[PDB]
Design a protein around this ligand. Structure first.
Ligand SMILES: [Mg+2]
Lengths: 776, 67
C-alpha cells in the first residue's frame, strides 16, 4: 500500500459555465474556508470574460493582426478562421458563430475584441460556473505528502462513469426505513421496529422497455484517460439511447504537469426523447435523460526507473459523482453527507460511549443559525436562532461553552427544543402505532373532517424528512441523527470539554466560527481535509430522495473502509477526520453486475437479502459506475423544483426541504442595493433614493428603511420565470418542475457581500445576497 | 366490411396504454409527430364479391397500427 487517490468520493456540480480554470469553481478541500469571503463569484462575470479575452490576445496576436492590417488595405473565409484560433476560443464557442461574428463587420483590434466579447457574454454572462473536483495522488507508509513528479515520471488517470437513472426504479421513499437493524449513528432502530414510515415497493422507470438486453440502452456510459505529459481536456461523452439518439456530455477531465486530475461535470442538459414528454413527477419521468453521472477513478504511477504503481484496489482508488448546482455554497446543510459517513460506522446502542467536545456541537447551532439566509423560518420563526442573537447582543455567547452547573439550565433550554431522532417523543400510542401529537404535514388529498388538535410543540429543525408520506408519523419531520443528538445531549448535561482558547474566541457565534475556520485552515492532514471537504457541502438528510446522494450512503455496508483517525487539531475535534472508501466492483463498466436489477419491482426484501455478502443481492453495495446517482430524480431539475417548501394549514413556520443548497427564501440583489449604502454616501442615488431624499430624512428613519429592505425575503422559485409570470399565468407546482429544466441556470445564486458601514441599522457587516437576472 | 374505426385511433394520439388519458387535447399535441402515421385512404379491389354486397372497389385506410 504505497499510493492513494484523494478525495475517496469526489464531487463535481453541473453548470453552463465553461470547463476552464479561471471561470470554474473547485470543490472545497478545506471545510469552512470561505464562509465569509465577500469577493466570491459563483456566476460568470463580465470582468472574467474581459480578462479571459485579453489573455487570448497575448500577444503575437496583435503583431499578426497588423500583419493582416496591411493586406486589407469585410474579412474572408481564410482570414476569418485564421484570427479564429490564435485566439484559442472555439473550445468555448462553436467556430461558426465565432466566424459569422466577424463575417458581419464593417482600433481594428477592438472591434474584433468587442464583437467576440459579445458572443462570449451571450453564451456565458451570468452562467452558473461549474464546480470541479481536484483529485490528488498521495504517498503512504497512511497518507502524508502529495505526489511530486520528477522529470522522467508520469501519472495516468482513468475515469469510467455511467448514468442509470432511466434504467433504475421509481423513488417512492427510502427502502431502509423498513430494514431490520440494531440502529446506527444515522438511523434509530425505532423507525423500522415500530413501522413509523414503511418502505414502499417501486416499479421500473421506462417500464415499456423489456428484457435486460434492451434495458441496457437506458444506461449512458463513457470513459477516458489523461496523463501528466499532456494537459489537453478529454470529454466524457455517452449516448442515449445507448450504443434518433442524443449525445450526452457526462463530464470533462484534465491533468496538469503536476499530476492532479480536474473533473468537470456536464452542462446541466436534460431532455426527453419527445418534446411532448413532460417531467411532471418529482422523481420518475420516463422518456427522459440527464447528464448526471458517477463513476470509478483509478490511476497508474509510472516512474523514471520504470517501477509502475497501479492504484485500482478499493482501499486506494476513488469515486466521483456529479450533482445539481449548490446555489448557496457558503451555507452548509445542518447535517452533511460527511456526518453520515461519521455516523455510519457507529452503533446506536453504543452511543453512551461517545465523548463530546463543544466543537462537536457548535456546527449544529452555527449551521442552523446561518440557515436564516435561505429560509424564512430560520430568520423569523426559530427561537434558538433568536436566542443566539440575544447572546451575541451581550457578547455573551461564551456562556454556552460553560460545562458547569451554573449554565445547565441555559444549555438544556436550547437542547430541549431539538427533535429527538429516537422519534419516540410527542406521540400517543394507538393500542401498536405511534401517532404524533405535534403538528403534522398533511397530504394534499384532503378529508373534510376536523383535524385532531396538536398538544405538543413543533421541535427543531422545521424541515420535512424521509417519512413525509405518512401524516402523523414522527418521521414526517427531520431530526439530527442519533450520534449528533448524542453530542447535543452530552452538552446539555454538561458532559463535554472545551479549551480555554475556545472560550476566549466565543464572545459571538461569528467570532468562534472563524476561529474554528482557522483550525481547519491550519490542520496538517490535507488529504483527509480534502476528503471531508468534498462531502461537507452535501446534504445528509432528509432523503426523499435528497439533492445529491441518498440513503445507501448512511449505511456502513457501502464502505469498504470507514475509520476514525484524528481530531482536526490535537485539542479540537470538530467532529473528527476519517479515512473512508467505497466498496467498488474492480471491473467497473465491464462488471457482470453492471446491469443487475430485481425484476419488476424493488422492495426492502431485496435490501434485506443484500446484507449477506454471499447473496444474489449483495451486488447492491459493490458500486459499479452509475450506482450512486441512479436512485435520484430524473431529470434532476424536477427533483430540485420539488425540493422547496411544504406548506401546512398553519402559516408559520414554513417547512423547507433542503434550503442550504436549494434555497427557499432569499435576500435578492434588488434589496441589497436598497440597504448597502450609508446615509453618508456621496452618490446621486442612495439605497434606491435620490441624494436629496436620502440625506433629508432623520438618521433614525434612514436606518429603519435599511432594515426594512434587509427583511424582505423572496421565494427562490420566483427568482426566474417558472410558469407564474404573465397575465393569468397558472404558476403552481407542476409548471415549476417543467420549467426548471430550462430555468435552473437562471435561478438566484447566493453569495456573501459586504455592508461597509451598517451603523446602527442592525444589518451585519457580511450579508448573503441572491443574484439572478430577474431580481437585480 | 361494416367495421369502421375512428381515424384518430389509426395512430397513437395519446389514448394508447394502461390509463392513457386520451382526450381532445392530447390529440392536438400528439398530431405534431403523428400526422405522418395517420391512416391513408386508398381505392382497392375486391375481385369476386359474389352476393355479399361489398362493392368491387372499396376505399381502405392504411396505417402501421392499422395492420
Ligand atoms: Mg449550500
Amino acid at each position: 500500500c504505497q499510493y492513494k487517490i484523494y478525495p475517496p468520493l469526489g464531487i463535481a456540480r453541473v453548470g453552463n459555465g465553461p470547463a476552464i480554470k479561471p471561470l470554474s469553481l473547485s470543490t472545497p478541500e478545506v471545510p469552512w474556508a470561505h464562509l465569509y469571503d465577500t469577493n466570491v463569484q459563483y456566476l460568470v462575470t463580465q470582468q472574467e470574460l474581459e480578462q479571459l479575452l485579453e489573455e487570448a490576445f497575448g500577444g503575437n496576436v496583435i503583431n499578426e493582426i497588423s500583419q493582416i492590417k496591411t493586406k486589407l488595405d469585410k474579412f474572408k473565409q481564410e482570414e476569418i478562421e485564421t484570427i479564429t484560433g490564435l485566439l484559442g476560443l472555439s473550445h468555448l464557442v462553436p467556430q461558426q458563430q465565432l466566424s459569422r461574428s466577424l463575417d458581419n463587420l464593417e482600433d481594428i483590434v477592438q472591434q474584433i475584441k468587442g464583437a467576440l466579447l459579445k458572443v462570449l457574454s451571450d453564451h456565458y454572462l451570468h452562467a452558473v460556473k461549474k464546480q470541479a473536483q481536484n483529485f490528488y495522488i498521495y504517498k503512504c507508509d497512511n497518507p502524508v505528502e502529495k505526489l511530486k513528479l520528477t522529470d522522467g515520471d508520469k501519472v495516468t488517470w482513468r475515469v469510467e462513469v455511467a448514468n442509470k437513472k432511466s434504467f433504475w426504479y421509481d423513488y417512492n421513499n427510502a427502502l431502509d426505513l423498513s430494514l431490520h437493524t440494531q440502529g446506527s449513528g444515522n438511523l434509530s432502530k425505532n423507525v423500522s421496529k415500530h413501522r413509523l414510515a414503511p418502505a414502499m415497493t417501486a416499479k421500473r422507470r421506462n417500464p415499456n422497455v423489456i428484457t435486460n438486453s434492451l434495458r441496457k440502452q437506458l444506461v449512458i456510459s463513457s470513459q477516458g484517460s489523461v496523463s501528466s505529459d499532456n494537459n489537453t481536456q478529454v470529454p466524457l461523452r455517452g449516448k442515449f439511447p445507448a450504443n434518433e439518439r442524443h449525445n450526452v456530455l457526462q463530464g470533462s477531465i484534465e491533468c496538469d504537469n503536476e499530476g492532479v486530475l480536474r473533473f468537470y461535470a456536464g452542462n446541466g442538459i436534460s431532455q426527453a426523447l419527445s418534446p411532448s414528454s413532460l417531467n411532471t413527477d418529482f422523481a420518475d419521468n420516463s422518456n427522459w435523460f440527464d447528464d448526471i453521472c458517477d463513476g470509478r477513478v483509478t490511476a497508474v504511477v509510472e516512474l523514471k526507473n520504470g517501477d509502475t504503481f497501479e492504484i485500482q484496489d478499493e482501499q486506494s482508488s476513488a469515486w466521483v459523482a456529479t450533482t445539481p448546482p449548490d446555489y448557496a455554497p457558503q451555507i452548509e446543510p445542518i447535517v452533511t453527507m460527511y456526518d453520515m459517513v461519521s455516523g455510519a460506522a457507529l452503533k446506536e446502542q453504543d452511543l453512551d460511549n461517545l465523548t463530546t467536545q463543544f466543537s462537536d456541537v457548535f456546527p449544529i447551532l452555527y449551521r442552523l443559525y446561518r440557515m436564516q439566509w435561505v429560509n424564512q423560518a430560520d430568520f423569523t420563526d426559530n427561537a434558538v436562532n433568536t436566542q443566539i442573537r440575544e447572546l451575541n447582543s451581550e457578547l455573551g455567547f461564551a456562556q454556552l461553552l460553560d460545562n458547569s452547573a451554573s449554565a445547565k439550565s441555559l444549555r438544556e433550554g436550547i437542547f430541549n427544543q431539538f427533535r429527538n431522532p429516537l422519534f419516540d417523543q410527542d406521540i400517543d400510542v394507538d393500542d401498536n402505532e405511534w401517532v404524533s401529537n405535534s403538528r403534522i404535514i398533511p397530504s394534499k388529498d384532503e378529508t373534510n373532517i376536523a383535524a385532531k388538535p396538536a398538544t405538543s410543540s413543533l421541535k427543531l429543525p422545521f424541515y420535512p424528512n424521509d417519512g413525509i408520506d405518512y401524516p402523523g408519523s414522527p418521521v414526517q419531520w427531520f431530526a439530527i441523527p442519533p450520534f449528533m443528538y448524542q453530542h447535543l445531549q452530552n452538552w446539555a448535561a454538561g458532559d463535554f470539554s472545551v479549551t480555554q482558547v475556545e472560550k476566549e474566541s466565543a464572545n459571538t457565534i461569528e467570532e468562534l466560527g472563524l476561529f474554528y475556520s482557522e483550525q481547519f485552515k491550519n490542520s496538517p492532514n490535507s488529504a483527509l481535509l480534502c476528503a471531508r471537504g468534498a462531502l461537507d457541502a452535501l446534504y445528509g438528510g432528509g432523503f426523499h430522495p435528497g439533492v445529491e446522494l441518498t440513503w445507501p450512503m448512511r449505511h456502513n455496508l457501502i464502505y469498504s473502509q470507514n475509520d476514525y483517525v484524528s481530531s482536526v487539531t490535537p485539542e479540537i475535534n470538530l467532529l473528527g477526520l476519517r479515512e473512508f472508501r467505497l466498496k467498488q466492483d474492480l471491473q467497473g463498466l465491464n462488471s457482470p453486475n453492471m446491469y443487475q436489477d430485481f425484476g419488476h419491482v424493488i422492495a426492502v426484501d431485496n435490501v434485506t437479502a443484500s446484507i449477506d455478502p454471499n447473496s444474489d443481492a449483495a451486488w447492491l453495495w459493490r458500486s459499479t459506475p452509475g450506482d450512486l446517482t441512479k436512485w435520484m430524480g430524473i431529470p434532476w431539475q424536477s427533483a430540485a423544483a420539488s425540493c422547496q417548501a411544504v406548506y401546512t394549514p398553519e402559516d408559520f413556520p414554513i417547512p423547507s426541504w433542503w434550503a442550504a443548497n436549494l434555497p427557499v427564501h432569499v435576500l435578492p440583489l434588488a434589496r441589497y442595493n436598497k440597504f448597502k449604502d450609508s446615509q453618508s454616501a456621496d452618490l446621486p442615488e442612495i439605497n434606491g433614493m435620490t441624494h436629496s431624499i436620502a440625506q433629508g430624512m432623520s438618521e433614525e428613519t434612514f436606518e429603519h428603511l435599511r432594515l426594512e429592505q434587509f427583511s424582505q425575503r423572496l421565494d427562490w422559485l420566483h427568482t426566474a420565470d417558472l410558469g407564474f409570470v404573465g397575465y393569468h399565468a397558472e404558476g403552481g407546482y407542476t409548471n415549476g418542475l417543467i420549467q426548471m429544466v430550462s430555468q435552473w441556470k437562471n435561478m438566484a445564486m447566493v453569495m456573501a457581500r459586504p455592508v461597509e458601514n451598517p451603523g446602527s441599522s442592525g444589518i451585519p457587516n457580511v450579508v448573503y445576497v441572491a443574484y439572478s437576472q430577474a431580481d437585480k
